[PDB]
Write an enzyme that holds these catalytic residues in place. Structure first.
Site, PDB file in Angstrom:
ATOM      1  N   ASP A   1      -3.549  12.362   6.749  1.00 40.04           N
ATOM      2  CA  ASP A   1      -2.165  12.772   7.412  1.00 40.04           C
ATOM      3  C   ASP A   1      -1.780  12.456   8.102  1.00 40.04           C
ATOM      4  O   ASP A   1      -0.516  12.048   8.827  1.00 40.04           O
ATOM      5  CB  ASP A   1      -1.755  14.184   6.101  1.00 40.04           C
TER       6      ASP A   1
ATOM      7  N   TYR B   1       0.857  -1.604   0.015  1.00 35.50           N
ATOM      8  CA  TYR B   1       0.363   0.312   0.218  1.00 35.50           C
ATOM      9  C   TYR B   1       0.921   1.444   0.063  1.00 35.50           C
ATOM     10  O   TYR B   1       0.250   1.920  -0.109  1.00 35.50           O
ATOM     11  CB  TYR B   1      -0.612  -0.257   1.326  1.00 35.50           C
TER      12      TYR B   1
ATOM     13  N   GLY C   1       2.868   4.264  -1.424  1.00 34.68           N
ATOM     14  CA  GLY C   1       2.984   4.508  -2.704  1.00 34.68           C
ATOM     15  C   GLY C   1       1.162   4.341  -3.196  1.00 34.68           C
ATOM     16  O   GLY C   1       0.236   4.110  -2.865  1.00 34.68           O
TER      17      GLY C   1
ATOM     18  N   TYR D   1      -3.419  22.623   3.218  1.00 34.19           N
ATOM     19  CA  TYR D   1      -4.221  23.308   4.454  1.00 34.19           C
ATOM     20  C   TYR D   1      -3.652  23.959   5.580  1.00 34.19           C
ATOM     21  O   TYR D   1      -2.051  23.509   5.623  1.00 34.19           O
ATOM     22  CB  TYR D   1      -5.182  21.184   5.010  1.00 34.19           C
TER      23      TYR D   1
ATOM     24  N   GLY E   1      -1.659   3.701  -5.201  1.00 33.53           N
ATOM     25  CA  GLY E   1      -2.650   2.747  -5.593  1.00 33.53           C
ATOM     26  C   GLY E   1      -2.197   1.760  -4.464  1.00 33.53           C
ATOM     27  O   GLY E   1      -1.436   2.190  -3.926  1.00 33.53           O
TER      28      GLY E   1
ATOM     29  N   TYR F   1      -7.792   9.032   1.978  1.00 40.42           N
ATOM     30  CA  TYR F   1      -7.838   9.464   0.352  1.00 40.42           C
ATOM     31  C   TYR F   1      -8.904   9.321  -0.032  1.00 40.42           C
ATOM     32  O   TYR F   1      -9.781  10.450  -0.473  1.00 40.42           O
ATOM     33  CB  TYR F   1      -6.700   9.730  -0.201  1.00 40.42           C
TER      34      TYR F   1
ATOM     35  N   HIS G   1      -4.325   5.338   5.605  1.00 41.98           N
ATOM     36  CA  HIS G   1      -4.144   6.602   5.158  1.00 41.98           C
ATOM     37  C   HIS G   1      -5.043   6.205   3.364  1.00 41.98           C
ATOM     38  O   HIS G   1      -5.470   7.674   2.896  1.00 41.98           O
ATOM     39  CB  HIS G   1      -2.580   6.642   4.538  1.00 41.98           C
ATOM     40  N   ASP G   2      -4.852   5.366   2.803  1.00 44.54           N
ATOM     41  CA  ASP G   2      -5.816   4.758   1.255  1.00 44.54           C
ATOM     42  C   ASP G   2      -6.934   5.265   1.491  1.00 44.54           C
ATOM     43  O   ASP G   2      -7.480   6.004   0.159  1.00 44.54           O
ATOM     44  CB  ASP G   2      -4.869   4.129   0.276  1.00 44.54           C
TER      45      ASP G   2
HETATM   46 CA   LIG Z   1      -1.269   3.632  -1.407  1.00 44.92          CA
HETATM   47 CA   LIG Z   2      -6.475  24.874   0.705  1.00 41.25          CA
END
Ligand SMILES: [Ca+2]
Ligand SMILES: [Ca+2]
Length: 123
Positions: free
Chosen positions: A99, A28, A30, A73, A32, A52, A48-49
């Site tokens: 993040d 995971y 990277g 942000y 994709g 997102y 995290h993937d």
């Molecule tokens: Ca990934």
């Molecule tokens: Ca912004």
């Protein structure tokens, strides 16, 4: 944004090189990713993937323009501690926490260099 996520990782792990160390790792870490995570760090990236993906579907995020990769942000690094600013809008705040959670996660799991550059057959 990506370059800001890099800063967060540096905040938690000063001796790291984010774009190098946490890229092309496991199934995971990277661009994709799919299959079974090979270790805890890989699980951090899987989470995290998924985070997102949720951000891209979030109603408060405008279609491309607010994608997780380029949406800047506000955040702060205090004594190796990350803080997402209350100055962020709903979309930015969600991405910032994606993040932040990952940066923290990366900092609490072991790094196994043998899991770098794994072929898809291992996923
Ligand atoms: Ca990934
Ligand atoms: Ca912004």
């Amino acid at each position: 944004a990506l370059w800001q996520f890099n800063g967060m990782i540096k905040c938690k792990i000063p001796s790291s090189e984010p774009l190098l160390d946490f890229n092309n790792y496991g199934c995971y870490c990277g661009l994709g990713g799919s299959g079974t995570p090979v270790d805890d760090l890989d699980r951090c990236c899987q989470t995290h993937d998924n985070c997102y993906m949720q951000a891209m579907k979030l109603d408060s995020c405008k279609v491309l323009v607010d994608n997780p990769y380029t949406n800047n942000y506000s955040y702060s690094c205090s004594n190796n501690e990350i803080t997402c600013s209350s100055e962020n809008n709903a979309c930015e705040a969600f991405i910032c926490n994606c993040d932040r959670n990952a940066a923290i996660c990366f900092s609490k799991v072991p790094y196994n260099k043998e899991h770098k550059n794994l072929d898809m057959m291992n996923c």
